[PDB]
């Protein structure tokens, strides 16, 4: 166990990134003149996060520079801002310089770019999108059946995410990117060749290697290796990739799960005086659960909508429990979790074509009875196509993965005593 | 003609396999304590062959291990053994270890598995079964008419046979396997898909390719290719395969014919000092005929049964002449061959529910006046369904296949001078 130094270094690094994010949000709130209530709005924090993400999108910035937009300059950003006077909420659009946002981000991080914070914000946005909306249209359009949605974790993450974004995204998103590449390859013949051919080939190499590392058992690993070997892949290995994503429902790969909290929680924590540089942090440890335990976040509530359902959606987005079992999610939270079918709430974002006269603000109940450590595994699983098919046959609805690994009480900060759950609906998108 | 080295190598290999089989039978006879008369019984040799085949059946061994039988352990084998004291035959059941049988087989083959000998024994058993019994029940059950039986050569060969077993079995057996696959596919929809789907698809691929190579003329080859092309075959190509087997009666495929002698003959030859490693061997040459010429085999004869008919049945099983023309078979043997209809004999095997008081032993007259080289061809034949039908129309009961290819005298070991036969009943199962 020589990792203690390495683990402490990683904890210090993630704590530094969290502290930088919190101080940046504090600076943005101070400069934008929002009260304590207005600064704690999740919509305002999401708007600020989109501010940062659009400011630092280099490819998008260059695209807007060299193709100008229609009536929208490529130099400034916008975002919905909600402020309260006389008790009533209204939305107004602010215009802020991309250069100013970048300078604020650099200053809040001791003059360092700190792409880790940007990736963390992107992962939080992707988790929110996954927990809120279903992209079955993209599934059906590319040829994959809408039947599988568990593997679509992190499907909204843009390519600018680093290695963490690739690790956190599911097998289905990688397969979707692969099929998009294959479709673009069937479209035209001048592909795989030329100057762009080398770049697209190395991109295929890297994405197929991260899918290589994502998987668990040897037969499906060999299958992904073989479909990689194809120089000019086409329709047969199109169906091969469809089958490979198809087999992931039974023998899943290792997909990372992280607790990416909104910038509002980090800003409130930093405003309280918490210094994550010394105390450390861990995206899979108790720290995010404890931070959510003693943090208050307010959200805009549409008419005839349930605040409890929106709070549950926000909690699942925060903890990336969109595809987590309903029973274990209810046990961890302590309140029975409502699947997406009977969620009487729309998305947390408020559209432009909405009335600023019938909206109310409610506190988000982001409190959980139990806390658990997120696992990046896939579960116990113990020609090659027939071998893979034979593996699915063996699985019975009783195999117990993570044997001896339970949940822990919030007071149990080091996880001395796990709690064994005893076990209705079990699928969020069912 | 650069095959002389290849032909000599193949002759040496088959001679080595025959020598291994003979020495193995000698070892088994020595250890089981049978006299010269008892060791020459065809029933005892068949029992020893079943010993070896059941010992090395890996799938059957695993099945018996993990589903145990009722009162029969999965560790040992049994078989009828007939011994003579005071001149009277009795049957007693011996219990021998599968591990011991396997060790004896490996030792008798210089520590080599030698699956060629196992396949040769299986082909001998299949030829005996084809020459003895008619499996019209399996034909009618699967939907094919009982009308055709010529194509049913090697229908009793298990799947564990190698490429030689697939080559020696007839078109009808391959069609029977194909229709069994189709019936299992119509039974359930979850077929062709899943982990087992890939394995069954490649199995269909390989069996359809060996049927591909079995056939002779181009139109029927194209037809089998097209029925192969079907991803999820059903009733229409069910009838297509019925027609394809139906057309084989007129335009036959290339079915190999081999002289698989019983282990008794090989054991006697090895006991005489014959070394097949140096002299070589050939399953289609004069060597099996000459070996049968100077070998004596005794068999158990049931009451009111003709030894001549049983000897003829054993000879046809040995030379795989079950479906051979009656006239040419009589000409080669030198004695008029009795078809199965008036054969006054039952199977060579003696059932358990039989009396050990009215059975007698007689010598098998496995001597033939002439010897001929076995041919693996099918005969001269010189939409696609109509084209195939038109081909059957042309055939007239006079086309002479193997023109200039006659029989040869036993003294003519290199076949200098063929003998042209001049030509009653002509069908064994008629």
């Amino acid at each position: 166990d020589g990792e203690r130094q390495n683990a402490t270094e990683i904890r210090a690094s993630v704590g530094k990134m969290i502290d930088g994010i919190g101080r940046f949000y504090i600076q943005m709130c101070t400069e934008l003149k929002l009260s304590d209530y207005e600064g704690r709005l999740i919509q305002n924090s999401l708007t600020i996060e989109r501010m940062v993400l659009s400011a630092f999108d280099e490819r998008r910035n260059k695209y807007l520079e060299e193709h100008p937009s229609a009536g929208k300059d490529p130099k400034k950003t916008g975002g919905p801002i909600y402020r309260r006077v006389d008790g009533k909420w209204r939305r107004e659009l602010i215009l802020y310089d991309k250069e100013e946002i970048r300078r604020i981000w650099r200053q809040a991080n001791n003059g360092d770019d700190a792409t880790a914070g940007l990736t963390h914000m992107m992962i939080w946005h992707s988790n929110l999108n996954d927990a809120t909306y279903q992209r079955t249209r993209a599934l059906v359009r590319t040829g994959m059946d809408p039947r599988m949605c568990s593997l679509m974790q992190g499907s909204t993450l843009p390519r600018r995410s680093g290695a963490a974004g690739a690790a956190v995204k599911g097998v289905g998103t990688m397969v979707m990117e692969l099929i998009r590449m294959i479709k673009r390859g069937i479209n035209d013949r001048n592909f795989w060749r030329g100057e762009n051919g080398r770049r697209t080939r190395i991109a295929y190499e890297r994405m197929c290697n991260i899918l290589k590392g994502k998987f668990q058992t040897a037969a499906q690993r060999t299958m992904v290796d073989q479909v990689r070997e194809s120089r000019n892949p086409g329709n047969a290995e199109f169906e091969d990739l469809i089958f490979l994503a198809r087999s992931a429902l039974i023998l899943r790969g290792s997909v990372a799960h992280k607790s990416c909290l909104p910038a509002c929680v980090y800003g409130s924590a930093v405003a309280s005086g918490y210094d994550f540089e010394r105390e450390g942090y861990s995206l899979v440890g108790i720290d995010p659960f404890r931070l959510l335990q003693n943090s208050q976040v307010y959200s805009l509530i549409r008419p005839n909508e349930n605040p409890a359902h929106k709070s549950q959606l926000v909690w699942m987005a925060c903890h990336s429990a969109a595809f987590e079992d309903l029973r274990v999610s209810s046990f961890i939270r302590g309140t029975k979790v409502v699947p997406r079918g009977k969620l009487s709430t729309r998305g947390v974002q408020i559209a432009s074509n909405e009335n600023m006269e019938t909206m109310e603000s409610s506190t988000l109940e982001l409190r959980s009875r139990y806390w658990a450590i997120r696992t990046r595994s896939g579960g116990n699983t113990n020609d090659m196509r027939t071998e893979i098919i034979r593996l699915m046959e063996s699985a019975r609805p009783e195999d117990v993965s993570f044997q001896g690994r339970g949940v822990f009480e919030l007071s149990d900060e080091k996880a001395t005593s796990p709690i064994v759950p005893s076990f209705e609906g079990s699928y969020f998108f069912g | 003609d650069g095959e002389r080295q290849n032909a000599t190598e193949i002759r040496a290999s088959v001679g080595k396999m025959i020598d291994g089989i003979g020495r193995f039978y000698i070892q088994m006879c020595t250890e089981l304590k049978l006299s010269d008369y008892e060791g020459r019984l065809i029933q005892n040799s068949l029992t020893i062959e079943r010993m070896v085949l059941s010992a090395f059946d890996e799938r059957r061994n695993k099945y018996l291990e993990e589903h145990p039988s009722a009162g029969k352990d999965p560790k040992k084998t049994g078989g009828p053994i007939y011994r003579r004291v005071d001149g009277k035959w009795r049957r007693e059941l011996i219990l021998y270890d599968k591990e011991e049988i396997r060790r004896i087989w490996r030792q008798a083959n210089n520590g080599d598995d030698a699956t060629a000998g196992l396949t040769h024994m299986m082909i001998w058993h299949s030829n005996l079964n084809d020459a003895t019994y008619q499996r019209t029940r399996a034909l009618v059950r699967t939907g094919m008419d009982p009308r055709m039986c010529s194509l049913m050569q090697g229908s009793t060969l298990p799947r564990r046979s190698g490429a030689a077993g697939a080559a020696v079995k007839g078109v009808g057996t391959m069609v029977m396997e194909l229709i069994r696959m189709i019936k299992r596919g119509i039974n359930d929809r979850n077929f062709w898909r899943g982990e087992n789907g890939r394995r069954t698809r490649i199995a269909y691929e390989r069996m359809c390719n060996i049927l591909k190579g079995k056939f002779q003329t181009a139109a029927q080859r194209t037809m089998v290719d097209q029925v192969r092309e079907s991803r999820n075959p059903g009733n229409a190509e069910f009838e297509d395969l019925i027609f394809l087997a139906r057309s084989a009666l007129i335009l036959r495929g290339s079915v190999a014919h081999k002289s698989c002698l019983p282990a008794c003959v090989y054991g006697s030859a090895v006991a005489s000092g014959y070394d097949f490693e140096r002299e070589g061997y050939s399953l289609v040459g004069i060597d099996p005929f000459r070996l049968l010429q100077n070998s004596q085999v005794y068999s158990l004869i049931r009451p009111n049964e003709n030894p001549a008919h049983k000897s003829q049945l054993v000879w046809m099983a040995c030379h795989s002449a079950a479906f051979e023309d009656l006239r040419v078979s009589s000409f080669i043997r030198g004695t008029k061959v009795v078809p199965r209809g008036k054969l006054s004999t039952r199977g060579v095997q003696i059932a358990s529910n039989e009396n050990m008081e009215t059975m007698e032993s007689s010598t098998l007259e496995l001597r033939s006046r002439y010897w001929a080289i076995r041919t693996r061809s099918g005969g001269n034949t010189n939409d696609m369904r109509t084209e195939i039908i038109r081909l059957m129309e042309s055939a007239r009961p006079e086309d002479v296949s193997f023109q200039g290819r006659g029989v040869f005298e036993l003294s003519d070991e290199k076949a200098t001078s063929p003998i042209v036969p001049s030509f009653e009943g002509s069908y064994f199962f008629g």
Binding site: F323, A372, P397, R405 | -
Partner: peptide
């Protein structure tokens, strides 16, 4: 249709459910 099997996020002992009447058949 809908969601079928599961995406293990938390390290808790469980019995990961799947719906064979449609997944096994394809």
């Amino acid at each position: 249709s809908g969601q079928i099997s599961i995406q293990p996020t938390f390290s808790v002992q469980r019995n990961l459910p799947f719906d064979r009447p449609t997944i096994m058949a394809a």
